[PDB]
């Protein structure tokens, strides 16, 4: 299991970033890739142990990678750019550059031109209609995260304190508030369908949490808006009879 | 030079279907042809690996062809399940690096045995002022199109499965700032 | 037993420089080599051709050898190479007629490790013009041999000397040749 | 006398009757000592020295490496031979034969390929004893040369003929010495 940290990263036009990759134990060949939206991965660098055997995919002198012990790799990107925003993938291999490469999850890097448009989402949960309750004997709650920028969100449902994975329905990709703007805020929907008798019970508590990935801790913020830090915004509702 | 191209850029198909995804690479001086599948939170997992000297590579329900003189490789998936819904990447190897295609979005839609298409209106638990329209229990065939009115938002259709009884249902959401014809780009004759 | 024998991959990495060498050989003759410092494919075919070869293949393949070398050095208690005694022979490409262009050949045989100084001496003077040598071509015993060429004008007054230097020699060997 | 550690890798192809019987033998070498070897006739890695004992086992545990080397006799050997057929294998330079007394030496120089057959004739009759041949000489620049000498007793006007045959020649070359 090859893992990368962090899962998400958000910076401005001129800050310094690092990406970590833990390869599979025993793999001496390590790779770095970079994948943009709607495209396949691009080769970046290839370490054969502690030394890089191929760095022709590296696009700048701003890009540097290091694997000091033949295992954990760090991809350093200094003086970052808007065009450096992508999902950076990592891989590992037991054989040569032609054998099977085992990939990790990736790090979604989004480099902004300005952190002034970073807005956390506002969330609200909508109680089911008596129409679908009386009709299908089911009850569909709907969660709505709206007005967030950038795109880094993760939505999860919670019933009575436990996170539920059955009867859950979230959108694959969010929406643009105004599709014309580039700094357009985003919207994400989600559905939780339970049975009517379960919804018609005040003892049951339903909570929708959206995990927003925003500013770091060192990022200081001089603006009337509260600092849009990486945070969780929740919305809750009780069963009703 | 070398540029790999994948023809079905998007593929939405019912269950149990046999479908076809092909690759297209310009220059044929290649060391390897590889097929992957990419899933959102987990990255790529290898599916096949055809050597230069091979035309066929059969494994499970996956069947890939290799014509290197014509710069084409074709993937044939039999008895498609909703479980193998991913973006299928075709990669060719030029001896030095891995040359990746642009991908094919595959979505194998579960079958709804007893649909019941209807539109419901919800109320906000926080403040009974902002409302939301719901569209559930329709065919996987149904294509939900976003509103031509740019001030009304219509989400795409996801699928949720309920406990134990293996009952799924598609669902779409529309909201604004009434649910009569909120999904104006979806008329009963699909 | 074979009609032809090619070496589509003569890879080399010694820890001395550190230096390496990538050459393709067919029938014991060098087709091309990749300059690992300059990152270039330098062909040796005595013909015209449009073949191509990405030097990154050589840079990667040799980089795998460097990795494997450091491991086998540790597993062998640092068993190093043995400096073999080279064998030198100076002759002419064509029969020598005085006043007409010819080429002197210096053949250093049985080279290991692949580090050598091959210099031509005209009447005891370093020769720089018209001289060219090959790569380290592979022998069957996993040693090497090299060949240097000096195009010259054979006359009855210029004596020549091929000077070779190797760690297997306790003294810089000079090989004589007279028209 | 400084120390040096060397590692070699030879990807060798052996052709017999065109591409009818092709054999790949990849050799991993540590200071002239072959430690591992993948023979295409064997189908898997085999250790050649105690050093390559954990390497041949570790490589044979990988299924894809086995397939990348098993297909190499076509991906590498046979593909390159078809390029050989349009260049090196069509290279024919003609020998330059020369007779010079010392004992008579015949200098056959700058020819390719290596296949050649020279003979000494005295007054039309082929002279056998008293003939010394040197082994073939590699000039290193895709040319060969060979020296064949005839110990002789030159009386009256005996004509001596160096008679060579080479694939580049449709008729053999004969130079005489009166």
């Amino acid at each position: 299991g090859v893992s990368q940290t962090p899962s998400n990263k958000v910076t401005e036009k001129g800050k310094y970033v690092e990406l970590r990759c833990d390869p599979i134990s025993g793999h001496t060949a390590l790779y770095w890739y970079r994948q943009s939206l709607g495209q396949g991965p691009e080769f970046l660098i290839y370490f054969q142990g502690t030394g890089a055997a191929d760095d022709s995919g590296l696009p700048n002198d701003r890009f540097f990678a290091v694997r000091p012990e033949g295992s954990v790799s760090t991809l350093k990107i200094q003086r970052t750019e808007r065009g450096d925003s992508a999902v950076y993938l990592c891989a590992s291999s037991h054989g040569a550059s032609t054998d099977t490469q085992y990939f990790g999850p990736g790090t979604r890097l989004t480099v902004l031109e300005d952190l002034k448009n970073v807005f956390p989402p506002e969330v609200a949960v909508f109680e089911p209609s008596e129409a679908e309750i009386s009709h299908t004997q089911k009850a569909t709650l709907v969660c709505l995260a709206t007005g967030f920028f950038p795109d880094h969100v993760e939505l999860s449902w919670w019933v009575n304190g436990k996170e539920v994975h059955s009867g859950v329905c979230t959108d694959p990709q969010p929406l643009k508030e105004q599709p014309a703007l580039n700094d357009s805020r985003y919207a994400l929907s989600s559905r939780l369908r339970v049975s009517a008798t379960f919804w018609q019970n005040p003892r049951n508590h339903f909570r929708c949490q959206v995990q927003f990935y925003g500013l770091s801790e060192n990022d200081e913020w001089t603006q009337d808006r509260a600092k849009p830090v990486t945070q969780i915004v929740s919305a809750e509702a009780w069963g009703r009879a | 030079k070398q540029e790999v191209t994948q023809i079905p850029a998007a593929l939405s198909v019912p269950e149990g279907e046999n479908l076809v995804l092909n690759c297209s690479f310009t220059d044929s001086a290649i060391y390897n042809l590889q097929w992957f599948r990419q899933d959102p939170g987990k990255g790529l997992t290898s599916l096949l690996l055809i050597q230069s000297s091979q035309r066929e590579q059969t494994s499970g329900r996956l069947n890939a062809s290799l014509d290197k003189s014509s710069g084409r490789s074709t993937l044939y998936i039999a008895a498609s399940q909703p479980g193998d819904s991913a973006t299928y990447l075709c990669a060719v190897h030029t001896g030095a690096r891995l040359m990746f295609g642009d991908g094919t979005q595959l979505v194998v839609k579960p079958n709804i045995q007893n649909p019941d298409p209807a539109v419901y209106q919800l109320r906000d638990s926080k403040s009974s002022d902002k409302s939301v329209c719901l569209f559930t229990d329709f065919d996987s065939q149904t294509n939900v199109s976003q509103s031509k009115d740019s001030d009304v938002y219509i989400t795409d259709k996801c699928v949720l499965d309920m406990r134990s009884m293996d009952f799924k249902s598609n669902s779409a959401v529309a909201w604004s700032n009434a649910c009569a014809n909120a999904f104006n780009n979806s008329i009963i004759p699909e | 037993v074979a009609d032809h024998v090619a070496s589509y991959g003569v890879n080399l990495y010694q820890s001395y420089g550190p230096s390496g060498q990538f050459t393709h050989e067919f029938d014991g003759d060098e087709e091309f080599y990749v300059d690992l410092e300059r990152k270039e494919t330098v062909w040796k075919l005595p013909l015209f051709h449009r073949l191509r070869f990405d030097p990154q293949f050589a840079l990667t393949n040799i980089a795998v050898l460097k990795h494997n070398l450091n491991i086998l050095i540790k597993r062998s208690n640092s068993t190093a190479a043995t400096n073999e005694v080279p064998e030198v022979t100076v002759f002419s490409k064509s029969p020598v007629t005085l006043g007409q262009p010819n080429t002197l050949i210096c053949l250093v045989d049985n080279i290991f490790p692949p580090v050598v100084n091959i210099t031509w001496l005209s009447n005891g003077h370093s020769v720089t013009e018209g001289v060219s040598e090959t790569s380290f071509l592979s022998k069957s015993d996993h040693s090497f041999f090299k060949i240097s060429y000096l195009t010259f004008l054979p006359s009855a007054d210029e004596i020549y000397d091929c000077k070779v230097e190797h760690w297997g020699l306790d003294e810089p060997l000079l090989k004589h040749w007279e028209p | 006398s400084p120390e040096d550690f060397v590692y070699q890798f030879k990807g060798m192809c052996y052709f017999t009757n065109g591409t009818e019987r092709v054999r790949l033998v990849s050799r991993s070498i540590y200071n002239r000592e072959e430690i591992v070897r993948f023979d295409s006739d064997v189908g898997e890695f085999r250790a050649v020295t105690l050093l390559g004992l954990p390497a041949a086992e570790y490589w044979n545990s990988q299924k894809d490496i086995l397939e990348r080397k098993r297909a190499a006799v076509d991906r590498v050997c046979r593909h390159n031979y078809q390029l050989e057929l349009r260049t090196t294998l069509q290279r024919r330079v003609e020998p330059t034969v020369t007779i010079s007394p010392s004992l008579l030496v015949c200098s056959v120089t700058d020819f390719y390929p290596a296949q050649i057959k020279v003979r000494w004739f005295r007054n039309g009759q082929e002279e056998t004893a008293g003939v010394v041949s040197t082994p073939l000489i590699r000039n290193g620049d895709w040319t060969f040369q060979i020296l064949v000498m005839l110990e002789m007793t030159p009386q009256r006007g005996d004509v001596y003929t160096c008679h060579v045959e080479h694939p580049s020649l449709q008729s053999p070359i004969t130079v005489e010495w009166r």
């Binding site: 054969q48 040569a96 | 001086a29 | 991959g9 393709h24 070869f53 393949n61 795998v64 | 790949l24 390497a55």
Partner: peptide, 12 residues
Amino acid sequence: APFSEQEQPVLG
């Protein structure tokens, strides 16, 4: 383009 044989790493 001619093809060449590849080497694979040994266990570190």
